[PDB]
Amino acid sequence: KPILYSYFRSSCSWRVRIALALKGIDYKTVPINLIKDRGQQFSKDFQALNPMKQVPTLKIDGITIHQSLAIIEYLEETRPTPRLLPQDPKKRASVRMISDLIAGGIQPLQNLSVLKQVGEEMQLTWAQNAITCGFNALEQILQSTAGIYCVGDEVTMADLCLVPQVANAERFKVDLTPYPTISSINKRLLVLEAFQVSHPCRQPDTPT
Amino acid sequence: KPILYSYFRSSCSWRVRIALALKGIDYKTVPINLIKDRGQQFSKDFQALNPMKQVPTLKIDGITIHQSLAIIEYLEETRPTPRLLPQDPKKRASVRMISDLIAGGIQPLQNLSVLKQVGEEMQLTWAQNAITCGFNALEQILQSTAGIYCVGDEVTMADLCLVPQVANAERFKVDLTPYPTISSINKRLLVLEAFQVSHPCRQPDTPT
Numbered sequence A, B: 001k002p003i004l005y006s007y008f009r010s011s012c013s014w015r016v017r018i019a020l021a022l023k024g025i026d027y028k029t030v031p032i033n034l035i036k037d038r039g040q041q042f043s044k045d046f047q048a049l050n051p052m053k054q055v056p057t058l059k060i061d062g063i064t065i066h067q068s069l070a071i072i073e074y075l076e077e078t079r080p081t082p083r084l085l086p087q088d089p090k091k092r093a094s095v096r097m098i099s100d101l102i103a104g105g106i107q108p109l110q111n112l113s114v115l116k117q118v119g120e121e122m123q124l125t126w127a128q129n130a131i132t133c134g135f136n137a138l139e140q141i142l143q144s145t146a147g148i149y150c151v152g153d154e155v156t157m158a159d160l161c162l163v164p165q166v167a168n169a170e171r172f173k174v175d176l177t178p179y180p181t182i183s184s185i186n187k188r189l190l191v192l193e194a195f196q197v198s199h200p201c202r203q204p205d206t207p208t
Helices: A011-023 A068-078 A089-110 A112-116 A120-145 A157-171 A180-190 B011-023 B068-078 B089-109 B120-145 B157-171 B180-190
Strands: A003-006 A028-031 A057-060 A063-066 B003-006 B028-031 B057-060 B063-066
Touching: A003 A011, A011 A068, A011 A089, A011 A157, A057 A068, A063 A068, A063 B089, A068 A089, A068 A157, A068 B089, A089 A112, A089 A120, A089 A157, A089 B063, A089 B068, A089 B089, A112 A120, A120 A157, A120 A180, A157 A180, B003 B011, B011 B068, B011 B089, B011 B157, B057 B068, B063 B068, B068 B089, B068 B157, B089 B120, B089 B157, B120 B157, B120 B180, B157 B180
Parallel strands: A003 A028, B003 B028
Antiparallel strands: A003 A057, A057 A063, B003 B057, B057 B063
16 A cells, blocks of 8 residues: 655645545555654655655555656556546646646745755745745746646646645745736635645644 | 757756757757846746746747756657657656656756855855755665666666756766766766757857
């Protein structure tokens, strides 16, 4: 049975939990809380299951896969239904473009011990500028790719990266007023079951 | 005919040019120099080119694709031969894991709009630490995935991200002695034609 190594409000592991929920794969979560006295990701316990020192990893089918997006595409390739990528290559590129922008273009610029090394004073204003310049970019894309959801009228890998990123912007008190397509898409997905049963307000690494 | 927007030492456009060369797609490059006069990256010309203000964008088949890895996977799906991804889904995940680690995990901590923010003095100590902690992670993945190349004995998308990242490490005078699998694989790819005709010293945005 699949095992996932995750951090309850880690944006990137929420992505995998949504994908597991959408595919209907039962999975065990193994907590690793990442900031309690340098967290268990500076445990050099977690730093060679996946040497990147970070979230997530999925053991499945007798292998271990790191990187949220690589895991999600693995699940897409091996459990097709329901599809997380459209069939048309041109729209698949919109999905990957958007997810890469969030996963590689926005999230790295706001990751947390990115901002332990910033200097506490500049932690937030750098994450805010990062999310605003990204959301400035993203809204612009979604206004032509989006339909009901980020790409068209089906939930895709792009939406799995949207919801956790929008959750961070709110945590950083970033004003989504300028971003109506992002806001609207986010509301429509948060009413779906798989974005709820996976929510950081619904997961394992988690005290009272 | 396909148009690509690139910058001489831009790592992520070097990735796309390697994939075009491997796929045998002749393409026009259009330079956009990203440091000349605040660079062509802060031109709000280039900032809806690719809305995240960065390299690359590929015009092809009547659409616009941003994000190197999203462009590469489009090229893989629409020009199958030669494969940039193995057929076995388990091996596709190692490719994707490695590529995401370089593209989203290593380069974002040392990119140009990264260390505008650092401050002149610790620019270089930070980029070196980022690459060393990333390559420390990467070398260990490569020790079970690698064969002749990053994954097995065929060139994959993982190798297209390796070569430009290794170029970054060398520019930052990062000592590759601890990383023998990376150096060996990098040399074996550097003798291949598609990693040459794409090489920075073989592209358009060209002063002396």
